[PDB]
Amino acid sequence: ASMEINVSKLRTDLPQVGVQPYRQVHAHSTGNPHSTVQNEADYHWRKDPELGFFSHIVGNGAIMQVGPVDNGAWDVGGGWNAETYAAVELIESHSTKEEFMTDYRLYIELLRNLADEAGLPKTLDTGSLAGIKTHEYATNNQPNNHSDHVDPYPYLAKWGISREQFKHDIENGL
């Protein structure tokens, strides 16, 4: 396998959203300034799924698979919930640029790997249905939208990753 992924807190009780095929991988960040990857995985395990759910969390040098892939998700707050092959959240609790970069590198590699696994383009926020899409892009473009979320762009910017850099990294790898 390409990457070490901890599946110990993979929920087995989440609903399917839509039907196959799922044409998108979604890039998110948690919005939580303090939670670790384990805090997030623990909360995700116990939370009411109606409050939203996802497939992977990246943080503290680890990747935890917390929900199923290839099954849809309640991750983007609109019609593209039914296109979610995977939904990857980056933690927001980094104290240093070094900590951020350790996780950012895992995030890029994972997003690209999931797109490959799904047979989807390694492109970011394009006008095609298929590919990797940010929550911001889904908010701005999905049908039946009920979201205002713009992750992961504000958090990436906090630690010096621009819109253009994120696109370059997704499309080329690191």
What residues make contact with Zn ion under the rule CB under 5 A? Answer: 28, 135, 149, 151
Compute the least distance from the CB of residue 121 to Zn ion, in Å.
21
Please, what is the minimum distance in Å from the beta carbon of residue 1 to Zn ion? 26
Nearer to Zn ion, 18 or 78 (CB): 78
- What Rg, from alpha-carbon coordinates, does the chain have? 14
CA distances (Å), 39 to each of 4, 23, 144, 149, 167, in order? 19, 29, 31, 22, 29
In the complex with Zn ion, the residue whose CB is nearer, 65 or 84, is: 84
Q: Which is nearer to Zn ion, 28 or 94 (CB)?
A: 28
Residue 11 Cβ vs Zn ion, minimum distance, rounded to whole Å: 18
Exposure on the CB side of residue 44, measured as CA atoms within 13 A: 32
User: What minimum distance in Å lies between the beta carbon of 135 and Zn ion?
Assistant: 3
- Which is nearest to 58 in space by CA: 90, 18, 33, 83? 90
Nearer to Zn ion by C-beta: 23 or 28?
Answer: 28
